[PDB]
Write an enzyme that holds these catalytic residues in place. Sequence first.
Site: not given
Ligand SMILES: Nc1ncnc2c1ncn2[C@@H]1O[C@H](COP(=O)(O)OP(=O)(O)O)[C@@H](O)[C@H]1O
Ligand code: BEF
Ligand SMILES: [Mg+2]
Lengths: 523, 509, 519
Positions: B48, B81-82, B377
Amino acid sequence: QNPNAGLFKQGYNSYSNADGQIIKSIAAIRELHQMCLTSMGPCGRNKIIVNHLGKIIITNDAATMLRELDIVHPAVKVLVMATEQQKIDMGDGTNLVMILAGELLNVSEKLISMGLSAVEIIQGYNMARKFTLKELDEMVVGEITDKNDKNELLKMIKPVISSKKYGSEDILSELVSEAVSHVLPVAFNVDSIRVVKIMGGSLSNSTVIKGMVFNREPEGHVKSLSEDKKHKVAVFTCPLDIANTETKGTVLLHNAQEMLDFSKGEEKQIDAMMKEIADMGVECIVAGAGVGELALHYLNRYGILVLKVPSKFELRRLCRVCGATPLPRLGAPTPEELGLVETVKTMEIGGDRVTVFKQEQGEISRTSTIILRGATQNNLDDIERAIDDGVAAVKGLMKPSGGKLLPGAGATEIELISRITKYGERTPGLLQLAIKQFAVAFEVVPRTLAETAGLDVNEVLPNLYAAHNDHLYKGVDIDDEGVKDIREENIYDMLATKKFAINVATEAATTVLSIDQIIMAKK
Amino acid sequence: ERTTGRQAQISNITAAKAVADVIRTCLGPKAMLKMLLDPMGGLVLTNDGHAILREIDVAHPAAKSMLELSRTQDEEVGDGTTTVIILAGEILAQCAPYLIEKNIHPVIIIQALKKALTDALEVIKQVSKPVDVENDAAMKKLIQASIGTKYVIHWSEKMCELALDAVKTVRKDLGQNFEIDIKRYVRVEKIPGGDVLDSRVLKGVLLNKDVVHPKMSRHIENPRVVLLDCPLEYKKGESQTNIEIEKEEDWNRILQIEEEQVQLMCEQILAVRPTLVITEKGVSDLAQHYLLKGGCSVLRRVKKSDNNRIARVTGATIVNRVEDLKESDVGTNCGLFKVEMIGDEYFSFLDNCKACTIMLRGGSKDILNEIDRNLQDAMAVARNVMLSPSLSPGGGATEMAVSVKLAEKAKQLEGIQQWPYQAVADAMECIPRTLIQNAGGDPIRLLSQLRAKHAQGNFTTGIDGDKGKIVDMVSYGIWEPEVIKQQSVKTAIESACLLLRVDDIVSGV
Amino acid sequence: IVVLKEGTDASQGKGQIISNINACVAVQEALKPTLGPLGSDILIVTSNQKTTISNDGATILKLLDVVHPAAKTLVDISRAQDAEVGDGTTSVTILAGELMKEAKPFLEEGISSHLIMKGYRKAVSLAVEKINELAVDITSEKSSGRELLERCARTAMSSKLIHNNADFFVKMCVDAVLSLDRNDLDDKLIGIKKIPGGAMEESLFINGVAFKKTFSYAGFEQQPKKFNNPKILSLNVELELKAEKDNAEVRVEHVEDYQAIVDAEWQLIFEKLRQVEETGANIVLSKLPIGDLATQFFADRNIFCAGRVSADDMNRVIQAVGGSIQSTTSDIKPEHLGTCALFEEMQIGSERYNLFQGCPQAKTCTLLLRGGAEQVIAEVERSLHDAIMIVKRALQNKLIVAGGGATEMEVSKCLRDYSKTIAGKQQMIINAFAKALEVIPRQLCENAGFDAIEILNKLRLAHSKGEKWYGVVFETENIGDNFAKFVWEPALVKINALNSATEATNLILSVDETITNKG
Ligand SMILES: Nc1ncnc2c1ncn2[C@@H]1O[C@H](COP(=O)(O)OP(=O)(O)O)[C@@H](O)[C@H]1O
Ligand code: BEF
Ligand SMILES: [Mg+2]
Ligand SMILES: Nc1ncnc2c1ncn2[C@@H]1O[C@H](COP(=O)(O)OP(=O)(O)O)[C@@H](O)[C@H]1O
Ligand SMILES: Nc1ncnc2c1ncn2[C@@H]1O[C@H](COP(=O)(O)OP(=O)(O)O)[C@@H](O)[C@H]1O
Ligand code: BEF
Ligand code: BEF
Ligand SMILES: [Mg+2]
Ligand SMILES: [Mg+2]
């Protein structure tokens, strides 16, 4: 707390490219690029590099700055290498190899960002390069008639001298085109243009002699010869004195006679050797080797002007001034071996005495000297760097049709942008990207010329563009309004130079992209 | 010491760009785990984003600003977040050239970026569709979306459940907006062991504090709860209370009084006929006795946070002085009072067979922290929707839409003011790209196709994670709270705009 | 983790150019006081421990060490000035600096340096021609042959420790530029000698040549120490028994041969020795030794000598008595020898000095200098070289300009007037250089005390309003015709000065990045 694995060698530093290394390197290069990006062009600036042994240096040239610096980044040393190719194998265009090789790698990361493979960007760049050499062979406007007519030389050396020493651009190129003609026969060697310099006055006093000038003095009371045409001269590899025996050689004496007689004995034996040559008409003998005591004494009597010149590289370029020939032994100066000198007197330049070796018509010389006057030793040196830059470009216009020439002021470059892109969106596949980038790259030559000219580049650039799409003469107005015209001033980079450069910059920039890992060691 | 000029600018940009570089391989469904080592001792095995960047001290000022971006963003929405970090970088990076190469002043590049942001934000709400914050099924398949890309996915469904079953539980509309204080009313409780599924969202609280006296009720059927601040022992005077005795049988007199006041106190409590008395402070041994036969079980020492959550699932409003102990301060609406002994560690429950206590179980004290954060989250994007029933095309679709509508507009703007605007567009594209990369497919290839398909054929078309092919969102769906797409782009463009205001950096207080 | 230079400082930016300017200003302001007739003087005690005191701006800027690249060019252009000219060294730098100073406003306001460089470039060109245009060539245009060399060696000898004993030295100075062939003025002939002690003007002008007293051998004190017309033998080598150097081996198996070879050695010397006697000489000099026996011999037959004469001395000896060096004793012909008007062995300043005075046929004089301290004699020799060298370049160019700020002030006029016709950038730059020239008149007044402001300003009116030689009346502090007052200096100074000074100025304005390497 944190462990550490897979180590069994010694204490090195491995920069795997899979760690965004290619960019770490683009950085290092990006840094030294900015240094050269403001040295190019007449509007270029100098840099004072202070030696690792402590010596001041000021130069517009790029291959020189880099030389005098303590570069260390492996990916950078590579581009400094290409700046060597240029200075050795061309003498000119050293600066343009940097700016491009770097700019290539700069617009190179834009591609690496998308996902374009290393090998894909390489290929596309070479494809765009070979294509770029073709157009240059035909983008060529005029070509000097190989006339070699002194005035035709000044049309070439003048644009090379500006943007290195812009201001005396003519007083200079004129000053050299005059040194080259004095040695160029009637149906080239760079060495035949030895250059001297001495503090005093300004450059307005600079000169061109039909022979070199020497510092030391004539040795005998023979001060300086006469002002009536012709002077028989004899050069020597051997020293003027009783030769000796490489294996010992000591004088022995069994009886007083031997002695009493040996004394004056050798006395006249020297006179003998001297005499006989003085006789063959000689009157000026340049001694590359030592000169005995009694020896010069007798010659003093025979009005033989001497001139110790141990410089075996000077003595050889000297003979090619008078016509004489260096004589290994002593005694058989064939009337053929001898040469003729119009003047061999001693002039005081800047306060100190120096011996000359010129000619005012008769007996042409194949080694002239450019005597540069100046006040600041520093500057005076960067000038001799420009004199070389021009000469290098002349010796290059020789034999294999070097006269060819294209628009300077980046006018050529602007055309080259469109022309390389022509090939860009024309070649199918993803290579089309890199080939198009390779083209953008060529925008550094123009932009910087404007940037260095205090001109708002965002104005001169589009201006110079739409002004290029008959009339591909439009370049950057160094000094005003929009752009200017190349033709308007008889200024242009010859093909041989600017072409060989693009090829060296493309190699440098390409090898840097082929490295996908680096390893160093403690020093 | 000092660094004025592009010198400054550059190092800032590179700095910021590098910040991104680290967690870029943590954005995506196949995102890896950055096991970080904290100074205090233990470790952090999370992926995360914000939870990583927090555990990394940085030097370069920009790298410090860039790092806090992940925090303010983790404060608005629980998610995204990322993404903000990666975007916040690429923006600065995509400006780099027109910043110096094209010699555009920082004022101008800022004037444009601030402009391009608003337009860009339009395109976000433009592609966003609303949603039934109440439709349990929609909320689940919404929460589920932001549970992927995390170790907690092998129980995805099970998670959104505990998520909704808790968001809604502590919720309380109120209108005269919706207030959901997940923080103070959803105390989590990670218990080592069992299975993941073996975890539930108890509607009450769970304290491990046992009972004040052995022979005391282990579980009152429907207990009458009494929560109080004040301790249960002989108090003392807040003045120079000093007693002088020479009157022999007076020692016994005073020494007795103490027992007497403890009695009174027990009375006032016992009065409202209680079965369960939970105090934040202590419980005199004497008071235990009089509350024993008084008929009630006692719990000493419980945190304010722990207590005030009890007073929402027992109704029992907490009261200080007892001579004022009202009867309204009941203990109604509170199921049992179990006291399960979990592996040599007694607990106490207060479920009812306004504030719940999510109790997680996994396979280590370590593995649980993965869950807790992962859950947060989920439970946060649930709250977001609750307060903004709008969603955005996931799979980086939204990100690409804004890339085009902006790219198009920029190209049709004309003026130096175009280049910086153009960059915001070029920038945005990095998210579908980071995704496609962390997928394994060819970035230049898929993007050109995603971008094209976007240019005309719908905008809810992003990239599929484990696959690597461009898919339409609506199709297999993975919308995310529109709120996330707000912040991610709001502050990222701001960050860039701040750092671009720097032309000089200096060192010394 | 990688690097690109190994911890080796290097500054750049616009400030870089400004640093360099100011840097030079320092080295400049340093010499400003040593200017003008009433100019201050310096006392440098280098890390060497040698203590010096002088005004030759070159000599000062040479003792300052100075390592700053930029500011170090002021040291170079000052050296060249003491070469191609010989005087003005102090000023080449004052100006060179001053220009760089006036370039600051532009460089700061945000103007290209390539434009300032151009601007100054024309400014010099115009200013240089203007001097050539005023270079009053004369010969008998109410100036005479001697009164030019005198009037010019004088004004230039002013503002030096040698001043209040002017007349004595100018009459001495000119006399020694004439001592050598006016067809080839070679300083190396006026060979100077310094003698510990005496008045800073009890100095002596030898007509022929004077030299040390290398006479390091027994048997001296005999040999007359004075001759009128002696027969000088400018011999080059040896005169010792066993020889001073070089040898061979003598192997004999006969007792008689031993004593034989001995008698031979002796006769071998004596012969060469009488060979000299035979030349019928009174004075026998040699750049090599004259052994005990040798000098003893001539001593017997009233013939004077000296062994191991200074190399650069025999050459002045030749040029005096008109001899001609001879390496052997054999073919010694009489046109080889030489003769003066008078020879004596003095005891000047407690030091015996062999000197061949009186030589109407000489092309080389020598002059002994005196002083109460090895610093003053030293300053004279340098205060005099600055004069001799200016007399010399006033024969070769009878073109002169009236300094004392006039030439400088006037060249400003035409330059300032010109700028009117230009307007714009080039206007200010070329008009700047015009004002920048005012430093010489300016400073010249402050050094002495005169009202720098009023005297300057009052000069600008009259000078621009006519009087092309108005400068500063060193006497009644007021402006005046320095050409009329006879404050002359060859134009060769000013022309070289402004050329070479500006050079420095643009060499600096051209540098944007200075990379000092460490090591
Ligand atoms: N199931 C998935 N398939 C393709 N893209 C995804 C999927 N799950 C998350 N995403 C995309 O990737 C990003 C979320 O990734 P994540 O690793 O959760 O980062 P964050 O910490 O910002 O949530 C968003 O742009 C979301 O649209
Ligand atoms: F990966 Be994120 F912070 F949900
Ligand atoms: Mg996320
Ligand atoms: N007179 C000028 N006006 C415009 N461009 C010029 C002029 N003279 C030379 N140049 C430019 O100089 C550039 C090369 O820079 P220079 O400093 O000469 O480095 P090098 O010659 O070592 O590459 C060429 O592209 C040429 O167009
Ligand atoms: N007699 C004088 N009256 C007015 N100015 C003089 C006089 N003598 C020399 N000057 C001026 O003083 C300056 C020379 O300064 P000086 O101290 O002699 O150093 P340098 O001659 O080495 O520059 C020049 O302007 C010169 O014209
Ligand atoms: F600097 Be280049 F060689 F003209
Ligand atoms: F100081 Be100067 F050489 F007169
Ligand atoms: Mg060139
Ligand atoms: Mg002087």
